[PDB]
Structure formats: structure tokens, C-alpha cells
Design a protein around this nucleic acid. Sequence first.
RNA 1: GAAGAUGAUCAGAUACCGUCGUAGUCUUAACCAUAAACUAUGCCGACUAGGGAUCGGUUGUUGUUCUUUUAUUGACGCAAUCGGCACCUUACGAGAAAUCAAAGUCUUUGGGUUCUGGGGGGAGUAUGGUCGCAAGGCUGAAACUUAAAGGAAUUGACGGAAG
Lengths: 118, 129, 48, 98, 87, 216, 208, 25
Amino acid sequence: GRVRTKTVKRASKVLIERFYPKLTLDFETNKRLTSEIAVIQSKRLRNKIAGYTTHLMKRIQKGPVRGISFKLQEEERERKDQYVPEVSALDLSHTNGQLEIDADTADLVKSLGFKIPV
Amino acid sequence: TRTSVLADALNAINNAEKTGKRQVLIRPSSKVIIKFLTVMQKHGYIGEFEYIDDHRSGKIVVQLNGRLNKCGVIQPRFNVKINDIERWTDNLLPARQFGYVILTTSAGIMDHEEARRKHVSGKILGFVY
Amino acid sequence: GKGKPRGLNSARKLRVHRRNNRWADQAYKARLLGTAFKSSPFGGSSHA
Amino acid sequence: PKKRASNGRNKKGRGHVKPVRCLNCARCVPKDKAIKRVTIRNMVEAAAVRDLSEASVYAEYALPKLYNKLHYCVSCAIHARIVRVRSRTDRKIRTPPQ
Amino acid sequence: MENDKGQLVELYVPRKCSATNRIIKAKDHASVQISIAKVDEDGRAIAGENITYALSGYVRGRGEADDSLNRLAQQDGLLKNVWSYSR
Amino acid sequence: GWTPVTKLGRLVKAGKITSVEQIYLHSLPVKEYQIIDLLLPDLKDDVMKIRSVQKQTRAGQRTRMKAVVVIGDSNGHVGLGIKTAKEVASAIKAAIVIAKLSIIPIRRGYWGSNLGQPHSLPCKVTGKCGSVAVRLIPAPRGKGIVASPVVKRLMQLAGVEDVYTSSSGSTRTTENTLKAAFAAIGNTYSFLTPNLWAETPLAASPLEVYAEEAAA
Amino acid sequence: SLPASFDLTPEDAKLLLAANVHLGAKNVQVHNKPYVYKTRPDGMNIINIGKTWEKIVLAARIIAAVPNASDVAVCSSRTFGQRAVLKFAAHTGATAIAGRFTPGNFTNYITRSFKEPRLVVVTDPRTDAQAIKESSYVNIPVIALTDMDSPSEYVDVAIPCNNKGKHSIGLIWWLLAREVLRLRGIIPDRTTEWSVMPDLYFYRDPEE
Amino acid sequence: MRDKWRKKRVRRLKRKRRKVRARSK
RNA sequence: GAAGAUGAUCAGAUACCGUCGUAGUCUUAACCAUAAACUAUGCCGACUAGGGAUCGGUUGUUGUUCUUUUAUUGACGCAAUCGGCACCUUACGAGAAAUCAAAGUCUUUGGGUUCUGGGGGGAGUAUGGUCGCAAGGCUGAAACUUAAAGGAAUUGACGGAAG
Ligand SMILES: CN[C@@H]1[C@@H](O)[C@@H](O[C@@H]2[C@@H](O)[C@H](O[C@H]3O[C@H]([C@@H](C)O)[C@@H](O)[C@H](O)[C@H]3N)[C@@H](N)C[C@H]2N)OC[C@]1(C)O
Ligand SMILES: [Zn+2]
């Protein structure tokens, strides 16, 4: 089996959080990048970390990944976060000024001193 | 069968009190129950209470104010001489400074301090503290 | 409740019930059967 | 200790339940305690369905099913894995499995 | 509690439940003390002026805390026609 | 050389919260023992029992040491602590820490007349743990502490002078006896008496009037 | 008491009613019978909207009385309510807890995200039972959005609503945040329109 | 001995004492 | 199908397994009176918390199927209620725990009342009495002996247990 242990996986996640923009989908470029960025004590571990980083970067491009977060994805999901629809879903224009509430709710409405149209 | 209406009344009071209720229903009523409740109310352990006529034994609603720790009957109604009130007070009450043993004397139903003032004794009926 | 009579006029029942059940107490039963007097090697003395 | 609140059977509010004989060993087990399984099976194995369809003198003949209710004692039920020993908290689950 | 000279020989006169009048024990960590903001006619909560209630861990654990607060708040005018006395 | 991790610890390192009665009055959790050392400088602890507990393993028994510690200022505050550790010394230190974290107020009272300071309990309190139930009765002023030595030591550390005691169940189980006695003596401020019938205003929490000083 | 301005206003009744907030569960707890206006003969339970408003204003007042807004923890584990609590913490200055609640947040005082709220607000007592339980361990009042079937254990102030609807949860949190801002003085007064739409605080599926 | 089979042994033992002593009433 | 006979198995099996088979199994008249005859939980009475089902009775009420097109058809559906067999959650409370809606309202110890126990054995034995056709039932000791026996749970180990 070839399950990658916690050390390589955590190191890959840290690398992607910190240095996502300067990191690509190729193993050789990521190998040199890991060599310059990370102080890895062995070349075998360096290659394993570079390869797993390549795997994660290759997965990300198709869609987000749990655990990982870099300061471009968070900005874009914040921009999507602050979205205010110009027309409101609770604006009563969607039924043309009327409620569809059943008669029991209509008597609730009356009994609170309101005469809003149904 | 029902053997002591006072026992049922005081048990219902305790079970309402421990659950945090502020009111409790009592059935049946009796003169002894009303006198015991009046002794309790005089010392502040219960609020007001209201008797409900039903052309029968009656019902009572009692108001509870959270000061009651326990009330209960002593069954049998043991005969108590004057010099034996002290052992009942030692046995039944939490401390010497508060709480009451409730007696039925030929002078009427009273707490043991009123009994000591009038120098009377009868049968033991209950307690409250 | 509690399975013993509580009545004010129940003294005979309580006294006889206690009398019956002390026989299960080995010390009391030995004393009232007179076992030390009739079956002990020393006949109930301290020395022999 | 008491292992089950239901005593390992299903008798509340009656005195006696007549027995049934275990299918496997013919032991007498009370009907409420017996492990019971309702089975409806195709009379022909699914392999021979096409052979018997080809050989039929009829066209569109609905093949009959086998109906049987099976009764087991506890020993044979456990031995043949109709039921299994469960954990202390899992024993309380009474809904059928999936 | 106090002595013959009247001296209050008593540390820590403890709090009592607003709903049941029970004493709030020192290690009753399920008990809470609500503070509620006074509102003026202008509609702005007055600073540092609060109406406060205390509930025992018992009343809260029994699920009666919401009803007890309804009762207390409506009896102080913090609330109208939500709590009915007659059920 | 201590830095608090909770708001109460921060308020106690500052001179804002000065008495543990403030903590008790608002039923505040106490998760740092430096608070108790700071607001109760005079505390005496007694190690009451040391037990050896064993867990069976494939290779043999695993033995751990269990220590019960009682702590008190002999002036109305008392605490109980039990903890297990591989060595006796570490178990004792940890039990002292947990005993300090559990200090409670004890209500002293009078038997009869209120002459002098309170000398006994104000009512009858019972506590129960396991099979052991410990009952504490107010005693007249000349009586010692009429109790077994473990319960007696707990009574002395709480500051009680005159008390009667009754025990039932398996009292030789020292831990359960001490927990029952600790529970009973701690019920002296749960028993409502007529002199406590008077309503008191709900004082603001020391975490409200010191919201800034409790931040960080 | 409370001036007549604080009454339930018709545009609020519009907003509340269009969201099916008044839709309660089939069955109702005994403690929540006061909140049931009446039962539609389908089986649903109508909720008194006026009492909902009263409890919203009450909860807003309790949230306002906390001297430090950061000590007011708002919680949601349901998918439909994390956006709402995130926006509530954004506008009011509260500390939010969205998604999984880590057991030990209130009781384990060495966990990194250890917090000691003065007050806790919860979207659902069923789905956020852990927050309520730990708050019971450490003397913290709870304000909960409660449906007709929501448990009442260790809840101080219940806000009757439909805490199972997508629109209702966001609506309730929006109303709470608006009332809090009004009471503090951020919003100048009680008639002016707020800068924020109720659409903000509404959850969304991820593919829009 | 599975308490049941001890009782059956005393049953048989007691049954034989009933016959030894019947020789003499 | 006890007994018995007999074939296997087995070191031996007068056992389990196979084949027979007497009493018995059934019934009518009489006896016998015992079971893990168990919920191992006396009976009467009051009170204390949430929930959905279900059987019997009664009382108000349909987008339902059906007499017949409809009533006083019937079934089903929706609500209340008294009684019952139970169940689920909780644990305020109880408990050594397992667990318990009673096994709660019990050192804050008293509603009425019956029965039973007092370390383990000897022993439900001996003896006397009594009931029975008998088998046995009921009542029921002592000498002597002994430091534990026992309950519930924990960790391990083991299992011709399971995964
Ligand atoms: C031979 N041992 C006996 C033992 O059999 C038993 O004796 C009872 C005895 O207590 C009963 O009798 C007892 O109780 C009755 C009660 C009903 O009123 C009293 O009248 C009677 O005086 C009293 N001894 C008696 N009816 C039967 C004996 N086997 O208990 C006492 C004992 C001495 O240990
Ligand atoms: Zn079988």
C-alpha cells in the first residue's frame, strides 16, 4: 500500500495555504519550489511532499477541498457571501400584494388588529 | 381506603411544594385540615387558601410561597403529656429555634409553643418547618 | 405502609411479633433455650 | 441480573401461552418466545425460470410462489444465524433491520 | 442570622429563585441571573439600568424557565398578553 | 508567576473581586486554584487516606495511588479533593488542587441561645454517597465533635465546634463517608430558615461591573 | 412599560407571514401550548405572531443589556442558519459559532477556541443541544428559536417560530439584529428603513 | 449436585428410613 | 413416549443420535395440593413528568369507501373522555448497582393492613403431631461445623461463541 502519512499530508496542506499562487500542477516545478521553501531533512520526504502537493493542487482546480484554505478562495467566497438580491424574496410583489394564507391564519391576522389584504 | 384525609392533604402539599408549584388542590376537606392549614398560614408557611363547596366533603385550593420545607402528620395520634412534648420536638424538628409540632388539645388545635404558653397538652397531630 | 401495624391499639401485635422474631437471634435463642446449661461441655461455667 | 425487561418473550397480561415445535429440532417453545419468520419464495430458482418458460405449453404463465411461516427455538435460531448476539444497548432495538 | 448583640454573624446571605423562592446554592452552575434592558420612550436602552431575575437550576432543568420568565416579565410590564393565568 | 485563562482569574489577579463570598453569591465556576489561594491565604489540608487501586492487564496488575485530601480555613470554608496518580506525591498534590477548587461556604449556627459567635449548625443536614449516609445534628456548646476521626477532621477544618453525628451504611469506605459528610455540611446554605425569608435585591455580578477588567 | 411604537407593525406581519413563520409542527409540547393560536385541520399548528414579536423584542432587550457585545454567542449547526448567525455576528458585533460545535468550548478552558459568553442564542434546541448542555454547566442563559416541538430544557427565553424553514430562520435573526441595533442607537430610530435586506441572512444552495 | 438431584437422594434416603422403622412401628 | 429392548458412537457409556415400545398421553367418577405456580416485585388509598400507539364503553365531528340516490347502514377519518394490556423518553427522585413511573413522595425517617428474613452449612434433616390409598403435603428442631458464602458492576484472560 501507498497511503501517505500525516507528515507529508500536513506539510502539503501548509504549503498550499501559504504559497498557492506560485505553485503549479507539475511535479518538477513543485519539487524545486518545495526545495526552496521547505527545509526538508531528506530527499525522499521532499519528493513525497511535492507529489502530494501536486495531487492536491490538481484536485483543487476541479473544485474546493476540505481543510485547505488560501487567501484567494476565502476572498471570493466572501464576495459571494455579501450578495444582496436587488429584488427581495420577502417583498410582497411576488404575489401582487396578496397573501395565500389559509382562513385560520387569516383570522390570526384579523385578531391582532391588522386588516392587511389576503 | 381513605384512612386519613389530613395525611392526603399534607402529602399533596409536600408534593406540590417540592416540584416548585405555587398552588395545590386538596380533596376531601375537613375541619381538622382547615385548622392545620390555619396554623400553617399564621406562621407564614402558606398563602391564602379557599374552600370550595360541592355539597359533599368539599375541596380546597392552597397558595404556596416557597417557604415550606416539610409538613406531615404523625400517625397514630399519640397521646402526649406535657413533659413529653420535648422529646417530640427533639425528634421531629430541624432545630430548636423554628418549626412546630402541631397538637390537638381540649383547648383546640395549636402549635406546641402556644400549648406551652397555655400549659395544655393533648394528642400529637403533625408538624411543619 | 412499612408492613407493620401502626394503630394506637396495636400494641399486642407489635409485642408478640417482636417476641416471635427474636428467636432468629442466635444469642437470645441460646439464652432462652438453655443450651449452655444443658449441652455445653462445661455446663455453662468459665473453667472446668 | 435481569437481562431483558420482557424476559426474552412477549407475554404481558396473560398467564399461559401454548407451545409450538421448533422447525429444526422439534423443541417445545412458547409461541410468543419463538423466533418466527414469514417467507415468500419463488417456487423455481431464478436460474431455471427461463428453461421452464421455454418448456411451458402456456404463454404468459404466472409462476407460483412458496409461502411458509418458520418457527425456531432460541438455540437453533442462534446456531443458524437467524438472529445474532447483539450488544447491550443494541439489544433494545426492536425495529427490523435493513 | 445574628447574635444577642444584634451583630449579623452570617457570611453570604444567598440569593433566592425568582420563580420558586428556593435558595440558589453556591455550586448551582445550572442557575442563571438574567438582566433585561430598560427602554425609554425614545426607544433606546438606558445604559446600566436593568431589571434582573434569577432562576434555580431546578426550574431551568424542568423546562419551566421560559414560562416563569413570561410570568415575571409580564408582571413587571416588560411584556403584555403572552402569559395567561387561567389554563 | 501565574497568568489567568478565565475571566474570574483575571478579576482576582486584579484587586476587583476580593472575597470568595462574591463568587459564591453569583454561583460562579472556579476553574483555577490560584483564585482560592489568593482569596483564602490561610488554608490547612489533611491527607485522610491513601489507597492502592489495581487494573488487570495481560502482563500483570497496573497499580495506581489514590489520595483523599480535606482542606479548610477552620472559619467556615471547607473543601474535599480526591485524585489518582501513579505516585503518591503527585496524587496528593493534585488532590490538594482539586480540593481547593471545591471550597464551599459552611453556615454555622447556634444550639439554643445566640450568645457569642456561632458554634454549631443551624439545622439538621444529611448527606449521602454510595451506601453511606452521614447525619449532622446541632449540639450544645460544651460538646466536642462527636464523630469518627475522619468526619471530625472535616468538621474541624470547616470551623464547626459542637456537633453530633450519626452514620449508616458501610462507613469503612472512607471516600464515600467523606463525600457524604461534605454534602451534608454543604446543605447548611440550602436549608431555608425563617430568618432568610426576607427578599434581598439581586446585586449585579462582579463580571458585569468589571466587564472591561475581565476581558483579557 | 414599552411605548406603543414597539407594537407589532403591519409590514412586520407581512414579512413574518410570507415566510411561513407561523407554521408549527404537527404535535406540540405542553410547554409550547400557549404559543399555539390554533390547529389547521391538516395537522399543522398556527403560532401567535404577536407573541413571537413580544419574545423577539424581549430577547433583543436581553441581548442589548450585555455590556460587551462580544460576550453574546450566537449558534447554529443546521445548514439553514449558519449564514444568518454569521451576518448577525457581523452587524451586532457578537461572536458566532456556525456548523459543528466543539464539545468543550464552554467547559474546557485550555481549548484554543475557549469562550465564556455572558449569553447564548441558539437556532434549534435539538440540533444545538451541546451548546445548551455546556451552558447549563457554566451558568449561561439561553435564548432559543423554538418550534412547537423544540425541547424546553435549559432554555431561558424561547422565541416561538418555525426554526425548520429556510426563510423563517433568517427572518427571525434579521429581526433580532434590527431590534438590537435600534436599542443600542446604531439605527437612529424605529421607522427608518435599514441598510440591510432580509435576503441577507437567507441561506443558499451552492449552485444558485 | 444440581440441588434438584440432592432432594431426590434425600427422597430415596427418607423412603428407606420409612421401611427400616416400619419393621418395629 | 418415562421403564425396558435394540443399532451406533466411545477408552467405557446401561447417555446424547437411530429403531421399537410399556406406563403415561385422552375421557368419566374420585384423589393428590405441588412448579423458576415469576413481574423472582402482597393488598387497599392519595399524590408526583413528558410522549405516541392500542383494546372496551360513551360523547362531539369528514377532501373517505360503501347501502342506495340519500336517513336511524356500515366501515374508515378527526377529536374528547372513563376503564384496561403495554410501550418510548427523562431522571426531579430512588438505588450497591443492574436498573425503577415505581423499586419515587424513605435520618426532612409515621395513610391502613397481612405475611416473610436476620452470616454460611447441618436442614426443610431428625423427632412428635397432622392430612393422604400411596407417592408425598403441612408443621418443624438441636448437637455439631465454618470465615466467609453471597449480590451488582470493572479491567483482563479464556470460550468446541459471533463479526
Ligand atoms: C420450635 N421453634 C419455634 C418456632 O416453631 C416458632 O414457633 C411458632 C410460634 O412463634 C407461634 O406462636 C407464637 O405466636 C402466637 C400468635 C399467633 O399469637 C402466640 O399466640 C404465641 O404465644 C407465640 N408463641 C406458634 N403459633 C407456632 C410456632 N411454630 O418460633 C418460636 C420457636 C421457639 O423458635
Ligand atoms: Zn430448535
